[PDB]
Amino acid sequence: ASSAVITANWISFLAISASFIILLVISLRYKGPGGTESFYNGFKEQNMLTVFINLWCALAYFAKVLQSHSNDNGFAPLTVIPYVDYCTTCPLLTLDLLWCLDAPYKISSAVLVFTCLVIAVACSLAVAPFSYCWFAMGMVLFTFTYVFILSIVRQRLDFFTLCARDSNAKQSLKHLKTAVFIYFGIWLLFPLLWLLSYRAANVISNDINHIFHCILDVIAKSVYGFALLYFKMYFDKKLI
Amino acid sequence: ASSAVITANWISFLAISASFIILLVISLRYKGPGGTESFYNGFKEQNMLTVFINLWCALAYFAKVLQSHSNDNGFAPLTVIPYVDYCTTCPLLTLDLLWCLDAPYKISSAVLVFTCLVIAVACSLAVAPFSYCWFAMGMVLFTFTYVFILSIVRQRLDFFTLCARDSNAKQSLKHLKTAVFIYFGIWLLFPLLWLLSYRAANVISNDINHIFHCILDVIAKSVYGFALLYFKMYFDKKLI
Amino acid sequence: ASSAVITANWISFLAISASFIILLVISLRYKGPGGTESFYNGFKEQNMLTVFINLWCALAYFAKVLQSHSNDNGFAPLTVIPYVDYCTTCPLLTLDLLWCLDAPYKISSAVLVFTCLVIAVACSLAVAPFSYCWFAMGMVLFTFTYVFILSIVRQRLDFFTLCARDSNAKQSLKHLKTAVFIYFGIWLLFPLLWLLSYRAANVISNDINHIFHCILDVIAKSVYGFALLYFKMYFDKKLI
Numbered sequence: 001a002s003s004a005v006i007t008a009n010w011i012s013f014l015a016i017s018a019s020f021i022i023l024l025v026i027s028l029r030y031k032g033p034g035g036t037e038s039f040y041n042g043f044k045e046q047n048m049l050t051v052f053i054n055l056w057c058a059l060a061y062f063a064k065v066l067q068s069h070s071n072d073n074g075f076a077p078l079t080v081i082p083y084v085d086y087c088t089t090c091p092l093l094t095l096d097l098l099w100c101l102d103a104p105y106k107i108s109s110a111v112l113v114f115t116c117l118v119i120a121v122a123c124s125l126a127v128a129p130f131s132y133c134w135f136a137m138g139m140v141l142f143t144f145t146y147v148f149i150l151s152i153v154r155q156r157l158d159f160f161t162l163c164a165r166d167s168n169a170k171q172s173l174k175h176l177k178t179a180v181f182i183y184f185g186i187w188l189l190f191p192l193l194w195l196l197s198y199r200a201a202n203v204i205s206n207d208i209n210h211i212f213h214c215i216l217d218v219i220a221k222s223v224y225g226f227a228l229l230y231f232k233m234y235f236d237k238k239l240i
Numbered sequence: 241a242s243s244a245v246i247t248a249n250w251i252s253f254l255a256i257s258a259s260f261i262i263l264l265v266i267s268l269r270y271k272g273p274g275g276t277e278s279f280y281n282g283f284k285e286q287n288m289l290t291v292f293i294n295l296w297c298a299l300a301y302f303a304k305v306l307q308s309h310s311n312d313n314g315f316a317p318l319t320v321i322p323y324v325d326y327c328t329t330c331p332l333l334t335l336d337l338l339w340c341l342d343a344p345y346k347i348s349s350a351v352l353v354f355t356c357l358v359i360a361v362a363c364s365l366a367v368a369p370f371s372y373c374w375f376a377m378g379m380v381l382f383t384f385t386y387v388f389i390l391s392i393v394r395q396r397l398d399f400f401t402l403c404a405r406d407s408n409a410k411q412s413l414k415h416l417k418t419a420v421f422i423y424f425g426i427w428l429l430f431p432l433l434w435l436l437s438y439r440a441a442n443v444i445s446n447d448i449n450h451i452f453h454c455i456l457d458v459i460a461k462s463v464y465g466f467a468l469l470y471f472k473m474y475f476d477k478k479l480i
Numbered sequence: 481a482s483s484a485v486i487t488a489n490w491i492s493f494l495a496i497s498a499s500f501i502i503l504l505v506i507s508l509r510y511k512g513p514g515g516t517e518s519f520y521n522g523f524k525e526q527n528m529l530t531v532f533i534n535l536w537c538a539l540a541y542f543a544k545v546l547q548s549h550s551n552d553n554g555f556a557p558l559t560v561i562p563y564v565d566y567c568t569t570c571p572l573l574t575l576d577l578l579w580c581l582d583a584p585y586k587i588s589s590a591v592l593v594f595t596c597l598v599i600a601v602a603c604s605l606a607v608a609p610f611s612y613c614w615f616a617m618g619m620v621l622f623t624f625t626y627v628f629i630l631s632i633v634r635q636r637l638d639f640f641t642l643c644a645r646d647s648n649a650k651q652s653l654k655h656l657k658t659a660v661f662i663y664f665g666i667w668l669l670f671p672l673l674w675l676l677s678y679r680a681a682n683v684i685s686n687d688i689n690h691i692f693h694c695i696l697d698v699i700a701k702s703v704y705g706f707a708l709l710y711f712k713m714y715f716d717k718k719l720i
């Protein structure tokens with residue numbers, strides 16, 4: 001691979017590894033809002049989802065780094081077949097988002113995201129013009145899923161803001177809004193990147209697409225999980 | 241493919257898509273027995289299983305439609321490898337059946353169905369005479385699973401009928417019996433179709449086998465889910 | 481295959497099949513500590529995990545037996561790709577271990593074991609020297625997971641021993657300690673077997689590695705599940 005590609009892969013792998021190790025340490029050392037439960041997150045494993053996500057992401061990028069130094073394909077599921085790592089991760093991200101917010105249809109939303117990602121995987125491994133049909137079907141399903149998840153997220157954000165008066169509550173709400181903006185705005189770029197890649201309109205080269213994918217992953221995973229975590233720890237739920 | 245095959249694929253895809261969209265609309269608009277919960281199914285995601293099943297089925301058939309118009313294989317998992325779509329769907333159907341009935345060993349029954357379907361997948365990709373051994377092992381496992389699930393279903397049906405006196409309760413019980421008959425009688429045809437296909441006794445041609453599979457899927461998914469849904473909404477549980 | 485390989489495969493398959501059928505019969509006939517619940521394990525499906533594990537293991541070995549009598553590869557997922565059967569089974573074993581002990585991070589520990597096994601699968605299908613890097617990463621992850629799971633297991637064993645005074649309680653504690661020793665000591669042999677196989681230091685031939693793998697599987701599944709089961713049935717929890 002090119003110098004830029006290998007450098008971006010190494011930087012992304014190191015960033016996600018550091019983020020995974022910090023998140024795991026914070027989760028293990030977290031003692032709950034009361035500061036008395038030794039294994040608060042042990043009996044509430046959903047709070048660990050973020051951590052696992054990062055770990056998986058890190059592993060994927062690790063494979064990429066190996067593929068960056070060898071002429072032969074590395075771990076095919078995480079390097080060869082596109083969007084499989086996303087198939088594994090994004091549903092967990094949606095489940096965590098709708099769990100911290102106590103939103104309805106968390107499992108349904110996660111399954112919809114997984115189905116959209118599998119449709120995208122089929123589209124990326126298809127041949128035109130059938131690839132166009134697969135992309136159109138995925139686009140309709142993702143539009144429906146996006147509208148549904150926004151409607152739930154907006155209604156939970158309004159509910160949370162209605163009963164948030166403490167300064168710490170306001171700071172946690174700002175972090176939650178930042179995480180929500182990262183989740184919604186950034187996710188819309190992935191379809192734009194696919195439609196702008198060598199597939200369909202070929203304008204952006206492979207290297208720039210890969211670097212943009214790496215940057216979007218790093219942001220929307222590391223910063224997203226950190227913000228979610230700031231919000232979960234520093235937002236009193238009993239204010240409901 | 242032949243005109244009959246493509247016509248059957250299109251009809252099945254349209255029927256399952258319409259069934260998925262109607263079931264999703266009904267589930268989203270359903271407000272619970274009391275008619276006061278805005279997200280009754282949101283906090284009870286098992287009631288959405290049916291919907292997801294149909295959606296997945298629809299997607300599978302969509303792939304078939306694409307494979308029906310191209311000389312190259314489409315989405316291999318849903319078109320090339322047989323029974324993989326069934327591997328994904330049937331365990332969910334069993335889980336939903338044993339959940340609406342509040343039956344024991346729902347997860348165990350789903351795992352048994354998944355194991356039987358994986359054994360069938362191995363059998364379909366094997367070479368004789370090892371295919372015969374795989375089929376025999378799958379037949380013993382499926383016989384055990386069928387006897388166990390019938391025994392649970394019959395005992396829950398007797399329990400439900402013991403305390404069902406309302407006219408609406410009787411109508412819901414009739415729909416539940418129709419769904420149970422569809423689940424049990426129709427499922428016995430799939431092994432008969434496999435034993436009658438080009439594998440083992442080659443009497444029925446590929447096209448007729450495909451059309452019969454499409455009809456059985458459409459019935460035992462669309463009508464089955466509609467009946468289950470009639471039963472879940474229009475059967476007061478508090479009569480226990 | 482050689483006479484020794486086929487004999488070991490047949491013996492392992494028969495042992496695991498007999499163990500699965502005895503465990504399933506005991507679980508179905510078990511009526512709970514009170515001896516009044518007809519479906520005690522039906523509403524507590526975690527107690528069935530062991531059974532399912534054995535069944536899956538049995539199926540895997542069945543495939544091996546077929547591969548032992550044909551020049552062509554059998555069910556590739558359970559015979560060709562190494563550690564995939566382990567990917568399916570070991571996480572369930574860890575989940576069951578941490579569930580019977582009411583240990584924290586049971587799902588987290590299961591996901592860590594699954595990630596370690598997937599890393600091992602990637603390592604076994606890699607090419608040197610990238611295989612060495614994959615093995616090193618898997619070794620660090622497994623060391624962390626081993627230390628974490630030991631720390632949880634030791635703390636739950638101390639907790640259980642603190643309030644175990646009955647003779648039957650002592651007998652169940654002895655069986656639990658035997659199961660824990662099987663889980664910890666035996667698992668350390670698998671990495672030693674991999675490091676001693678044709679990969680890395682080639683000293684032990686393939687046949688001896690296969691026989692050792694079969695013996696370790698048989699012990700650490702059949703005897704492990706039987707001990708876990710002796711402990712779950714014959715240990716009064718109300719003594720907490």
Ligand SMILES: *C/C=C(C)/C=C/C=C(C)/C=C/C1=C(C)CCCC1(C)C
Pocket residue numbers: 083086089090093116117120121123135138139142187190191192194217220221
């Ligand atoms: C950490 C990585 C994440 C959250 C990746 C998310 C990716 C998507 C939401 C992708 C969506 C796509 C479509 C809606 C259309 C088809 C192309 C995709 C896969 C880019």
Ligand SMILES: *C/C=C(C)/C=C/C=C(C)/C=C/C1=C(C)CCCC1(C)C
Pocket residue numbers: 323326329330333356357360361363375378379382427430431432434457460461
């Ligand atoms: C919606 C589709 C469904 C419910 C399909 C179900 C299929 C089966 C129950 C198939 C069973 C089989 C056997 C018991 C023996 C081996 C051959 C099979 C796969 C047809």
Ligand SMILES: *C/C=C(C)/C=C/C=C(C)/C=C/C1=C(C)CCCC1(C)C
Pocket residue numbers: 563566569570573596597600601603615618619622667670671672674697700701
């Ligand atoms: C029933 C079979 C079981 C429990 C198998 C367990 C296997 C392991 C814990 C294997 C671990 C390995 C490593 C930690 C390093 C890489 C090589 C492995 C897969 C042998």
